[PDB]
Design a protein around this nucleic acid. Sequence first.
DNA 1: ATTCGAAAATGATTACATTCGAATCCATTCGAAGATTCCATTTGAGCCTGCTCGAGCAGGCTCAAATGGAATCTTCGAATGGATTCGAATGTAATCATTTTCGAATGGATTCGAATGGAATCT
DNA 2: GATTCCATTCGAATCCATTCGAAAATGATTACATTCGAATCCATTCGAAGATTCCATTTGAGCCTGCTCGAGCAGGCTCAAATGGAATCTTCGAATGGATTCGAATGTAATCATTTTCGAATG
Lengths: 90, 96, 95, 81, 90, 89, 79, 78
Amino acid sequence: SRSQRAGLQFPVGRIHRHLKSRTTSHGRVGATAAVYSAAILEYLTAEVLELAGNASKDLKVKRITPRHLQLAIRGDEELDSLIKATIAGG
Amino acid sequence: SRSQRAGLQFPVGRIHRHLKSRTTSHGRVGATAAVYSAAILEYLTAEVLELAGNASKDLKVKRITPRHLQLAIRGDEELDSLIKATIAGGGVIPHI
Amino acid sequence: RYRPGTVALREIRRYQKSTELLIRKLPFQRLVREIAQDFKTDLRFQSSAVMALQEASEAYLVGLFEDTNLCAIHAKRVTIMPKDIQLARRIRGER
Amino acid sequence: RYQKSTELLIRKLPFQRLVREIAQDFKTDLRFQSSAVMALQEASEAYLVGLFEDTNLCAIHAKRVTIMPKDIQLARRIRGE
Amino acid sequence: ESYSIYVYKVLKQVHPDTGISSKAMGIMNSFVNDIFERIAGEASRLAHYNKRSTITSREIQTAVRLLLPGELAKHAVSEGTKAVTKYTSA
Amino acid sequence: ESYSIYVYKVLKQVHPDTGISSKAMGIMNSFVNDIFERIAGEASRLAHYNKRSTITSREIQTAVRLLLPGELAKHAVSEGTKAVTKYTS
Amino acid sequence: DNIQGITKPAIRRLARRGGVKRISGLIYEETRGVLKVFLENVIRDAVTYTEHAKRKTVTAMDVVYALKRQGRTLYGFGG
Amino acid sequence: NIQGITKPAIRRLARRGGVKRISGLIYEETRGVLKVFLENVIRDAVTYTEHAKRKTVTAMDVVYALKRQGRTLYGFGG
DNA sequence: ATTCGAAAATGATTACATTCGAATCCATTCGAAGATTCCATTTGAGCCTGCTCGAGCAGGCTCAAATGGAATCTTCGAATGGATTCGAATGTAATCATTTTCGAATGGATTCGAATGGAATCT
DNA sequence: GATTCCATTCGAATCCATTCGAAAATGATTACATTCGAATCCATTCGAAGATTCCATTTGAGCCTGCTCGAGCAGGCTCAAATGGAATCTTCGAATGGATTCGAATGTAATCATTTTCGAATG
């Protein structure tokens, strides 16, 4: 598929459709904007998940819980600046 | 015209065109959304201008300057809450 | 000739009534160009760009000094100290 | 004790009562989802904890360990509230 | 294009003997554009939330209620409703 | 519609032994949607400023530069550029 | 009298989570006032949202949208 | 070039803020905070300039950057 | 781990938007002069800040009693949510008939000046 | 009672705002074509009022003790004043560069009709 051509796990067609559905006036969206966006989203997801999993394994526990996510986000300066939301259960 | 039909000074057709130009996807805009929006813009304009003209008259001058706009905005709780922008030419409200 | 605190209040009255710019223009222009040379080389600036930058900078500094004065009064002083700037900037969300 | 936990520090029945009483001013005969009240409680506790952190900073600035209403007022004024 | 014509009309309505400068005119144009962009964006979001496509005066009224401080939103709502009623009567 | 499939695939890529609950999965869904809306809005504004109609990868790159901080932006730009280059070839 | 259900122990716990060592005796009334103001703002926005949709029930997404409007995003309840 | 923002200028900026007395260590702090603010804004302005394939920084780039920073300004085209 | 309505991918086809070269022509940069005006340095002084110590205040912890919250059905009628027209309203397509925007021109409004008669400060 | 600052008071050239003109957008009208938002009807949830507890949290009272507060010095550090001395600012003039417009020429995104797979609800 398009995701396998780009070498990603996130969907390119669905993200392209969403991008088209969120453009003002009579605008158009290229096929490489979707590839760029899928790459960015996958990268950020992997970063957050990696930090949270390291925090979880520091507790000798397999599963990731919202507390692990909050510990990972608040312990990182970049992820702290980017994510200012309140995590329910963390 | 549409503005005179609604009883306004601001343009209904031009605002309708702009509203159409800033809608996501294939969005339609009704003819009364423009009337409502023109009424809102005219109301806010009139409030700001009335306060600024009062400030201008208190200082014994004819014209309105950015200083008078700043004095009018900062002296009103609602306008101060709504307009948080920086005005280029009117400095502060004299305090202690 | 004048007690310490008289001329200070006179200038407080003076600069809270005017509307001009309180920083010289050539030094600010030089500083802006020197800062911008770290992002791209051989840049050009409109005069309006530097004027807008100066207006925004002066507004920012005056608001910060108002917060700093609040902090100084909280601690039962009239002199402003760097700790007040730090506290105001930390509560604001900058530090 | 309360720093390292994740629970909610307010009882749920009083908070729900207060939420409904406040909402009575905007529209009579209002229903609520349980999730709406739970979200309101989470947000409220987060807000209060952050405000208390700012208040402690203000208390330390004045060379005290006890927090006073003036610290809350200074913190809220600098925040623009 | 600008808003100077209508701003001057409103000024001559409220203060018949008061003028205005060019810097004040620029500031007024900036103010009008700012508020218009805010209202338009919020109305578009409201239309999206309800799975709708058309923007009506209901979206505008809700946007006005959400964006304006109280005792300022009530008079704005009254003025807009009066304008729409007068427009539809003809 | 959700991102649970792809979040799970990425997690299996990063930590092949750890799992994830449902509350954490919902939080991750919220995070992904938040970032997507931010990027889309910035790109649309950028296209409007230049008086253009199409949204391209230049708009996405500029939005990522404006929204992400520090080294996050650099590594994200690298990943996106690599993905586009691998896609077009 | 529903704001007197926010008791002294609860305010003390919320202050302890913020790193506070000692509390004045006049802090509880101030805390109740600030909580009332915050709740009033958020609930006003949420009721606006539920009135637009022609509903009689306040949902979690109305609260989420209202909080996002105030600049206080919240993860874990939808969105 | 940061020393071209003199101490009389900072005194004027403090007087417009209502400040009565000033410590002698306030000027270096002020220079640091001004430098941080200016770098933050100029980064975004140059990003906007580079997107448009231009070599000149215009006032609209500055206005957009300030609006992104949350520091809207009136009187320079928006 | 299964089925499957749902959606993405394939293959042309146009128009449509974007890209490539000129051609100005604004406007940014650069160099020069100089006269005042801001700034820098020192000085002398007074007021404000910080420290100590005692004096008054009030917060935390303990305990016995009282109280209100949480938790799990039960139900039941209220209230969203989905279907099918359907009737209200928006957009597209030409044709005018304004209307607004870009030029120039003199009435008031603003600005700069020495002059002079008043609040304001030390003494 | 002798400075120094404010606070009008009258004089005029200048800068600027407010009227006038011509011409290219651009609303407003008329007439379809057709989406899209409403109105009734029927399902399914879901929220609210009730009941009954053990129990876990909250409430005074008080007592100790730690904390904040007020008063008095000491010093040290910021302010006000005067005198040189750099240097900004205004105006001037050329020279240089690069943003915008405008034709031509590609690059490509959206809309069809088939085909296939894939994500979501259910186990």
